[PDB]
Every structure is written in structure tokens, then in C-alpha cells.
């Protein structure tokens, strides 16, 4: 075992993994653990050097700011501004020389994950046989002639790895061979939303459908890696992923011949395509549910070559069969790219390619008939290796790397959700068209004429949840989905315990206890890409959304959503007709005592003696500068949902009520705000009798 001293981390935190054989760190957002995300145990009593990418010693582990890569070269134009590096949310613009037309994204913003928004900007004279391949921001491009059969090479700034084609050739078709390259840090990752979209977008064409040839067939080979490096936990977690992949695919109508292989020192086959059954998704799903990590524990090496040769066995033939050059092949590989026996896995692909007659004719590519996808488990992935295996297809992405095995499940879990039933609570599919409201469908603007502008969440087809203090005493209207149209409401349901004057007797003006209200609309709502419900605490919809069994209790949900710690949450604020997700932390742990105590600094409470008077067990608490500096709500955000974003879904846990300091100008920033400026939210878990009641006839299905 190893001693946990000196393992701190500026403006951040950490949590032990693998019983303690390899720890790991957790930063806010737009921050990355420097220099390494995880260490590995040394049998000396000290965990490890504080090295880096390179091999030099650091003395105080910190959470650095995520940086977007600076353009090394941009051809045929200028870009504004030029900085050593780019900060989160920074904007960079591209302008073209005279005679050149800009294709791609003229303006680009730096995103919270170190990737630039939009697509690669290119200044093109339209003279090349092909377009100007461009220079993806972060790479360097050699070769400037784009005639027929010319090539260009890419490489990345040392300390980064290349993803995509390192070389691309101009083809007869007019397109470039391979796929657009990009530069990857050790700390960069793919959000599950990106992987979900990217994968299906490649695997299929568009309600999507899988494209088979007339009277054709598809073979899907699932190759899982079970070497010691993977680990036990991270293994059965990948087994789950493959389960959901089986469902998702089957739901595209076509019955594919499957193949199942786990590997290590040796490959074990669990299903061969040659068999008459294959096709049964229940058969395969059952075989899959069988596999245990202890199947390789003995001989636990990483001989990926042998594993792919297994797949080369299932493809071969006696004479050539009937319908061979009509069958689409698709490999799903789940390794960490750390092969250490057998040699270069690539030599097997090039073996398969020649077996399927792929890339052996200038009149026929047959490139469509083979796809190799590679999913990288998490940190300690060799991106050079999982990339050289994945297919390189123009305008499609075949190689993926995600933060942890948790997030990888999130991918396949979100696929079965595109899958349908827009009535599905807290479900937002990341279409690249941004378009605001598409990203927060549940948001409801409110105006009560007198004027006042609160917020709310859409819980059912009839009901909108908001704060009770927005009302007192036709006079009121609701607007949703960026719809100018404001909707007729039938009646407001105040919580029976609510009373803004509850303690006007003790010289304490506004008493915000039980500050929740429901608004039943006069007209049912029809969901859509910009109007959906949000999950409520203690529903079957939530239990399902969280990936739990039907035998999950109400307390178990709370213990899962609102644990006794610092909870990562988010609310929705309107800043000039645009909706943005502000990320805050619910102080529910050791910091919870001091968060509430800031209540007597809030206006009106100058006479308050014991804060238990105005802070009740119904309130949650956010804001302040511990652990991190949290954004604050506004009067205009009051009533809005306080959301928790777990397992790729959005569950509302609270209702925005009151604040200790009016930090809004309007505008907001200030830019800096008092440390005592907290925000209090009504904890929906504390108002369940009233919720279950009024929302009984609504399809939400509660529990206790």
C-alpha cells in the first residue's frame, strides 16, 4: 500500500482508484490535471515521480487552464488575433486574400474541451484538381500542389499525437484519400455526445438506416481486449456497452451475422459468423452476458495480432462462396492500444484488405465493405496505436477515446435514446446546429403583468414547475421553445405550506420556505426538438434514466443524486436572448454548514438571530468561492430548474429560489462577487407528498 501525503492539487480534488493501485484527479471544467491524470504504485511507499510528458520533475500538482491549439500555418489569408495560446471561450477569425474564397468556419470559438468549434477554415483558389485540403488547427502541412495524384503530409507539434491520415492523396474522384487529421493531447477527450453522433453518423446514413446492398448481408465482429492493463471494473463495463450496441443495431431492421472475441495472451472465440445461429441477438447477448474477466487472468498479455487473426479466420473460405463480394464487414475493437506481443496488429488489416479485395482496383474501391472502429478505454491509451487500426474515411471518424469507462457506457446508453420517444424526460440530442433551445428544451420563460420575468421547467405535457414567490395574485402567461406565442394557463398551484409572510411578526420580511408552484396549462403541449420534459426526483423515468433496476427506492435515488459532498450541478440563465449552462456546485458536504450561514448577510435579515429561522431543511445551497468560484443566479433566473447532469441525462433536483446578494446589474459579471453571495434552491426531494399528489394523473409514475 501507499501513503496519501503530498498528493494535493491546487483549485481541485482527487479520488483513489483500484483500491489504491492507481489514483486519479478531478478538476472543475476547462481545467486539466497537470502533469498526469493518474499515477501508478511503486513498491517503495511513495506513489510516483511528478514527471510529465517529457521526463523532468515538478513540485506542486495544479489544475491548469485548458488551451486550444494555436494555428501553426494558415495559407492564403490572415487570422485574428495571434496569441501564444488560446483560452477557453476565445474567438479567432479567418479572412482570405484577394482571389481566394473561404470554405469552412470563418469564425471559430475555443470550447471547454480544448477543441475549436465549427470546421477547419480554408482559403481556396478553386484551381486545384481537388480542393485545398486545408490545415486543421494544430497541425503542419507539407505539400502545396493539389493536382491529380499529388499528396500532402501532416504531423503534429511534438508532445501531441496525430489522429486521422498522416498522408492524403488527391484522387480521380476529386476528394482526398484518408480523413482530415487532428491533434490530440494526453488530456483531451471525446464527450459521449460527440462519440454517439460520430459513430452512428459513420455506421449509417440518413431516423437513420443501415445501408445494405440488395440481397446483401452484414458481419459485425466484436473484439474485446481482456489483458491485465484493462482491469476488472473497466471490463464488465465494456461488456455492458456491447450489450447496448447489440440492441441499437438490431433495431435498424437488419439481422447481421455476429462474431465475438475476447483476447489477451490468447484469443478465445465466443461466436463464429459461419454458424447458422449468429443472427440471434438474444443468443449473442446471452453469450456476451456470460464472459467474465477471470477468463484471461492466467495468461493476461496483450497479443492483439492473434485477436485480429481470429477475425481473419471467420472471413476466409474453402473456392469463393456465394454473396461474398456483397457482404459488408464491420470490426468493433475495444483496446487501449497497448499491444506488447505478436507485433504490429496492422499487418492483419492489410491481410484482411487483400482477402476482401479492398483497395485493389482504381475502378472500384470497395472501401465501403470494410469499417474498423476502435474505442479507447481511458487514460493510458496509446492514441498512435488505436488510430493506425481504425479506418481512415473522408468526412467520418472511426477512432474514439473517452475520459473513463463510465463515459463510454454513456455513449451507447445515449444511442438507445436517439432511438426515440421525445416524451423521454431530460433528453437532449447534440445536433451540431447549436440553435440554443435545442440544448435546453425544458426551459420556460414566464411573465406576470403588472412586470416580472421568472423561469420554469416543463415536467409533463400539462405542467410547468416554478417558484411560488413569483405570483401571489389570466393575469399570467408562459412562453416556451423560443416561441413568441405565450400560452393560456388554467390555475396556479401554490404549495400548501408556502407563506411569504410566515414570519413578518418577527421582523423578518420574506420567508421562502416551501417556495414551489405548479402551473397547469389550458392547452396540452406537443413535444419536439425544442420542447421536452425534464426528469423529476422519484420517478420510474429517473430510475431508468440513471441506469438502475425497477427495485430502486426513493432514498437510493437521493443517495445517488444528492450525496453528502460537493455536487456538480447546473442552471439556465438568459443573457441577451441566448441560453447558457452555468455550472455550479451544490454544497451538501462539510461545506454545507458555512454555505447556509451566509444567510444573515442577505437583505432584510438584519434582525435574524439563528439562521435556522430562514434556512430550513427544504433548501439546497450553491454559490460562493469554495471549492470553486460559482456563477450566480439572477432575478430573471428565479424559479428556473437546478439540474444535475448524470449518465447523459438531465434530472432536476431543485427550484431556484433566493440569493444573498443581488449580483445582477443587469449584465451580471461585476466582474467579481462577494464570497458570501450564495443561492438557495428548493430541494424537490423535500416536497414529494405535494408533487406526487398534484402530478398523479400525468404519466410520471412515482414510487413511495
Amino acid at each position: 500500500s501507499c501513503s496519501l501525503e503530498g498528493v494535493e492539487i491546487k483549485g481541485g480534488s482527487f479520488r483513489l482508484l483500484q483500491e489504491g493501485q492507481a489514483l486519479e484527479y478531478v478538476c472543475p471544467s476547462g481545467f486539466y490535471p497537470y502533469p498526469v491524470q493518474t499515477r501508478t504504485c511503486r513498491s517503495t511507499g511513495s506513489w510516483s515521480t511528478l514527471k510529465t510528458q517529457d521526463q523532468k520533475t515538478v513540485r506542486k500538482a495544479e489544475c491548469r487552464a485548458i488551451h486550444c491549439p494555436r494555428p501553426h500555418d494558415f495559407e492564403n489569408g490572415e487570422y485574428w488575433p495571434r496569441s501564444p495560446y488560446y483560452n477557453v471561450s476565445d474567438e479567432i477569425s479567418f479572412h482570405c486574400y484577394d482571389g481566394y474564397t473561404l470554405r469552412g468556419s470563418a469564425n471559430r470559438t475555443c470550447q471547454v474541451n480544448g477543441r475549436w468549434s465549427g470546421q477547419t477554415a480554408i482559403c481556396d483558389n478553386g484551381a486545384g484538381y481537388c480542393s485545398n485540403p486545408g490545415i486543421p488547427i494544430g497541425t503542419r502541412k507539407v505539400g502545396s500542389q493539389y493536382r491529380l495524384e499529388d499528396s500532402v503530409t501532416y504531423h503534429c507539434s511534438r508532445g501531441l499525437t496525430l489522429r486521422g491520415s498522416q498522408r492524403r492523396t488527391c484522387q480521380e474522384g476529386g476528394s482526398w484519400s484518408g480523413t482530415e487529421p487532428s491533434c490530440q493531447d494526453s488530456f483531451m477527450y471525446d464527450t459521449p455526445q460527440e462519440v454517439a453522433e460520430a459513430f452512428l453518423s459513420s455506421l449509417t446514413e440518413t431516423k437513420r438506416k443501415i445501408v445494405l446492398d440488395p440481397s446483401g448481408s452484414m458481419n459485425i465482429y466484436l473484439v474485446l481486449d481482456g489483458s491485465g492493463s484493462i482491469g476488472a471494473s473497466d471490463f464488465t463495463g465494456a461488456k455492458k456497452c456491447l450489450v447496448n450496441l447489440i440492441e441499437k443495431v438490431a433495431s435498424y431492421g437488419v439481422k447481421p451475422r455476429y462474431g465475438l472475441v475476447t483476447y489477451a495472451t490468447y484469443p478465445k472465440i465466443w461466436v463464429k459468423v459461419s454458424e447458422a445461429d449468429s443472427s440471434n441477438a438474444d443468443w449473442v447477448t446471452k453469450q456476451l452476458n456470460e464472459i467474465n474477466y477471470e477468463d484471461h487472468k492466467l495468461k493476461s498479455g496483450t497479443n492483439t495480432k492473434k485477436a485480429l487473426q481470429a477475425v481473419y479466420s471467420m472471413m476466409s473460405w474453402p473456392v469463393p462462396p456465394e454473396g461474398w463480394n456483397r457482404t459488408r464487414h464491420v470490426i468493433i475493437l475495444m483496446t487501449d492500444g497497448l499491444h506488447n506481443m505478436g507485433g504490429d496488429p496492422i499487418t492483419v488489416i492489410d491481410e484482411i484488405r487483400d482477402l476482401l479485395y479492398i483497395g485493389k482496383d482504381r475502378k472500384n474501391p470497395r472501401e465501403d465493405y470494410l469499417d474498423v472502429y476502435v474505442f479507447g478505454v481511458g487514460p493510458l491509451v496509446n492514441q498512435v496505436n488505436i488510430n493506425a487500426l481504425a479506418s481512415k474515411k473522408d468526412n467520418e471518424q472511426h477512432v474514439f477515446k473517452v475520459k473513463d469507462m463510465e463515459n463510454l457506457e454513456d455513449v451507447f446508453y445515449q444511442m438507445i435514446d436517439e432511438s426515440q420517444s421525445l416524451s423521454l424526460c431530460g433528453m437532449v440530442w447534440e445536433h451540431r446546429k447549436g440553435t440554443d433551445y435545442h440544448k435546453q428544451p425544458w426551459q420556460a420563460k414566464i411573465s406576470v403583468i403588472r412586470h416580472e420575468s421568472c423561469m420554469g421547467a416543463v415536467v409533463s405535457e400539462y405542467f410547468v414547475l416554478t417558484a411560488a414567490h413569483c405570483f401571489t395574485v389570466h393575469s399570467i402567461k408562459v412562453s416556451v421553445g423560443g416561441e413568441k406565442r405565450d400560452l393560456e394557463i388554467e390555475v396556479v398551484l401554490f404549495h400548501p405550506n408556502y407563506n411569504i409572510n410566515g414570519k413578518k411578526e418577527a421582523g423578518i420580511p420574506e420567508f421562502y420556505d416551501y417556495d414551489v408552484a405548479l402551473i397547469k396549462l389550458k392547452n396540452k403541449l406537443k413535444y419536439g426538438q425544442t420542447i421536452r420534459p425534464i426528469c423529476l426526483p422519484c420517478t420510474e423515468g429517473t430510475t431508468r434514466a440513471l441506469r438502475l433496476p425497477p427495485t430502486t427506492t426513493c432514498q437510493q435515488q437521493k443517495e445517488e443524486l444528492l450525496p453528502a459532498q460537493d455536487i456538480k450541478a447546473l442552471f439556465v440563465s438568459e443573457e441577451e436572448k441566448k441560453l447558457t449552462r452555468k455550472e455550479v456546485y451544490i454544497k451538501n458536504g462539510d461545506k454545507k454548514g458555512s454555505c447556509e450561514r451566509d444567510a444573515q448577510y442577505a437583505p432584510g435579515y438584519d434582525k435574524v438571530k439563528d439562521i435556522s429561522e430562514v434556512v430550513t431543511p427544504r433548501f439546497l445551497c450553491t454559490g460562493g468561492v469554495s471549492p470553486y468560484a460559482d456563477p450566480n443566479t439572477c432575478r430573471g433566473d428565479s424559479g428556473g430548474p437546478l439540474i444535475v447532469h448524470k449518465r447523459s441525462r438531465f434530472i432536476q433536483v431543485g427550484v431556484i429560489s433566493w440569493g444573498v446578494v443581488d449580483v445582477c446589474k443587469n449584465q451580471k459579471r461585476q466582474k467579481q462577487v462577494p464570497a458570501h453571495a450564495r443561492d438557495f434552491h428548493i430541494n424537490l426531494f423535500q416536497v414529494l407528498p405535494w408533487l406526487k399528489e398534484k402530478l398523479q394523473d400525468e404519466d410520471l409514475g412515482f414510487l413511495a
Binding site: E78, R82, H95
Partner: protein, 233 residues
């Protein structure tokens, strides 16, 4: 140890011979003397040199007008100057002479690394950069030779980095070195006279020019064929 950490040194690479090929319009309100003034912002490239900005305006009543050049002088206090030849031959050992320019009025102690590149054989390797440390008198230049052997054909980056001890003065340069293959470029010339009419009214000439014989050719180098057609006057 006293020196600036490598990762903190960003090498200069953007050395265009010409840029800012843009057109702007003088739309602003004229002043008392009928002159429209337009402010314009932009960022400089990496070159340590003097840029010369040339304007040329045209209006419908005042014809073409060429402005007197505005010069921009770009310079660091401490920097590397690297002169490359137009090309070097593959496999053939050459010397590259860099120059450390100290324009600080004091003596400095510097460190100079050559970065490792797989395209070259040199003193540097994947694990150990080739490092020199030495003093420079106040205002001196100093030459720093680097011996290298190009191993691949094409354009390849030579990157040199320098830093002054106990101070914030650093510079890096990354220039491209053109590497051509061994031998001499020759060319075969085939001529064909196109005269379809020479074969009757409905005239076709069909000419099959087969693969040209060229067996002096160094194996594994690029071949390029140009088919040109001129018309008869």
C-alpha cells in the same frame, strides 16, 4: 537550471516572403481637406526583419495612386538567425551555420539545443538533445554550426532553441530544409506532329506513345511527365 524551460520557448516558423494581400475601402467621412482616414489592425508574422507595406489606391476621378512605402521594423533583443541553402542532397553530410545575436548590452551565458528529427542523422537523438552552453560578450554575434545528414527526401524541419541564463530571454527557429534525391535530373523528349487532315477528309490520327525507356534511373524516385500541345500559326 537557471535556464528557461524548453516548453516555455515557442519557436518562430512563419516566414512568408509576402502577405497581407488584402483590399480595403475608404468609406469613412472625409475631413476638412477632403481626406478619408481608415484605421486598420493586424498581427505580424514571425520573421525578424523589416516589413515593407505598399498601398495602391484607385478612385474614379483621381486615377491610380502609389503610396510611399511604410516600413515596419521587427526585432528581438536576443535571437537566432538561420540561413538555409535552397536544397541539400540526400545522404550527404552538410554543415548548417546558425548565429546567436546578442543585442543586450551585457555579457550573457546561453544554452543552445538542436532538436531531434528522425529525418536527420545528427548529434541529437530521440532521448537526448544535443546541448551546448557558452558565454557571449555584450553585443557580439556568435556562430553555432550544426552537422547533419538528411536521410529522407522532401521538406524537413530544422529546429534550434536558445535561452539566456537567469533571465527571460529566449528564441526558437524552425526552418524547412529542402532535400532532393541523389543524381542529376534529365529529361527525354518525344515529338509528334498532329495533322489529322493528312489522312483524308474524315481524318483521325491515333498515336500510341508507349512508356519511355529510361534505364539510368535511380530506383524509387518520382517521375514526372508533361504533355504539351502548341498550335500551328
Amino acid at each position: 537550471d537557471g535556464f528557461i524551460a524548453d516548453s516555455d520557448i515557442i519557436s518562430r516558423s512563419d516566414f512568408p516572403k509576402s502577405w497581407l494581400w488584402l483590399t480595403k475601402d475608404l468609406t469613412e467621412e472625409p475631413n476638412s481637406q477632403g481626406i478619408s482616414s481608415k484605421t486598420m489592425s493586424f498581427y505580424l508574422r514571425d520573421s525578424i526583419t523589416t516589413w515593407v507595406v505598399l498601398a495602391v489606391s484607385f478612385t474614379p476621378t483621381k486615377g491610380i495612386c502609389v503610396a510611399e512605402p511604410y516600413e515596419i521594423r521587427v526585432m528581438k533583443v536576443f535571437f537566432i538567425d538561420l540561413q538555409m541553402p535552397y536544397s541539400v542532397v540526400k545522404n550527404e553530410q552538410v554543415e548548417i551555420r546558425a548565429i546567436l545575436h546578442n543585442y543586450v548590452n551585457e555579457d550573457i551565458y546561453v544554452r543552445v539545443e538542436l532538436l531531434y528529427n528522425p529525418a536527420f542523422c545528427s548529434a541529437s537523438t530521440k532521448g537526448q538533445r544535443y546541448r551546448q552552453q557558452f558565454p557571449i560578450k555584450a553585443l557580439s554575434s556568435r556562430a553555432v554550426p550544426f552537422v547533419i545528414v538528411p536521410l529522407e527526401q522532401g521538406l524537413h524541419d530544422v529546429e534550434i532553441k536558445a535561452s539566456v541564463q537567469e533571465a527571460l530571454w529566449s528564441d526558437g527557429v524552425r526552418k524547412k530544409l529542402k532535400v532532393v534525391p541523389e543524381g542529376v535530373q534529365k529529361s527525354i523528349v518525344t515529338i509528334v506532329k498532329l495533322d489529322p487532315r493528312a489522312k483524308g477528309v474524315g481524318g483521325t490520327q491515333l498515336e500510341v506513345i508507349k512508356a519511355r525507356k529510361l534505364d539510368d534511373r535511380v530506383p524509387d524516385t518520382e517521375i514526372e511527365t508533361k504533355i504539351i500541345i502548341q498550335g500551328d500559326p
